[PDB]
Amino acid sequence: QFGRDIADTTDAVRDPQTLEILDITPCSFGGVSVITPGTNTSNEVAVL
Amino acid sequence: AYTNSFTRGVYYPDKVFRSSVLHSTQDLFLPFFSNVTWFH
Amino acid sequence: PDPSKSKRSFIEDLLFNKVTKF
Numbered sequence: 001q002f003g004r005d006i007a008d009t010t011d012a013v014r015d016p017q018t019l020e021i022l023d024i025t026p027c028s029f030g031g032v033s034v035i036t037p038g039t040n041t042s043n044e045v046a047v048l
Numbered sequence: 049a050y051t052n053s054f055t056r057g058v059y060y061p062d063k064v065f066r067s068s069v070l071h072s073t074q075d076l077f078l079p080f081f082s083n084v085t086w087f088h
Numbered sequence: 089p090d091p092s093k094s095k096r097s098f099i100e101d102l103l104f105n106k107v108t109k110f
């Protein structure tokens with residue numbers, strides 16, 4: 001029915017209505033880091 | 049009569065695909081090198 | 089360092105080849 005990763009998380013499935021095999025990549029996520037000069041210098045910032 | 053099973057009698061234990069991995073599972077299996085009554 | 093190569097030396101490359109979530 002379904003595939004699992006090395007850590008036993010779900011990784012792929014058959015579609016219940018068609019025997020084609022589809023993978024499940026996690027949706028994109030990550031930290032937001034604010035690169036800033038000191039607020040004594042400027043109120044400009046850049047975001048990583 | 050009797051015979052050695054060797055390493056036989058493994059089967060896919062669940063409806064799950066896995067690849068490039070070593071997975072440890074507890075189930076009914078033919079224990080390795082077990083005596084297997086032989087008939088004809 | 090070897091300039092033809094990642095500009096590591098020869099031994100400094102063997103040291104890399106000898107060594108090896110969402």
Ligand SMILES: *[C@@H]1O[C@H](CO)[C@@H](O)[C@H](O)[C@H]1NC(C)=O
Pocket residue numbers: 017018
């Ligand atoms: C299931 O029904 C759909 C129509 O809703 C059809 O397209 C699909 O091929 C059917 N699948 C099977 C394997 O019966």
Ligand SMILES: *[C@@H]1O[C@H](CO)[C@@H](O)[C@H](O)[C@H]1NC(C)=O
Pocket residue numbers: 039040041
């Ligand atoms: C920056 O900080 C110093 C004290 O460290 C202060 O005297 C100065 O007025 C500050 N300048 C601005 C533009 O905030």
Ligand SMILES: *[C@@H]1O[C@H](CO)[C@@H](O)[C@H](O)[C@H]1NC(C)=O
Pocket residue numbers: 050081082083
């Ligand atoms: C199988 O049975 C025979 C006796 O019939 C015994 O000598 C032998 O050790 C047994 N083999 C195993 C693997 O237990």
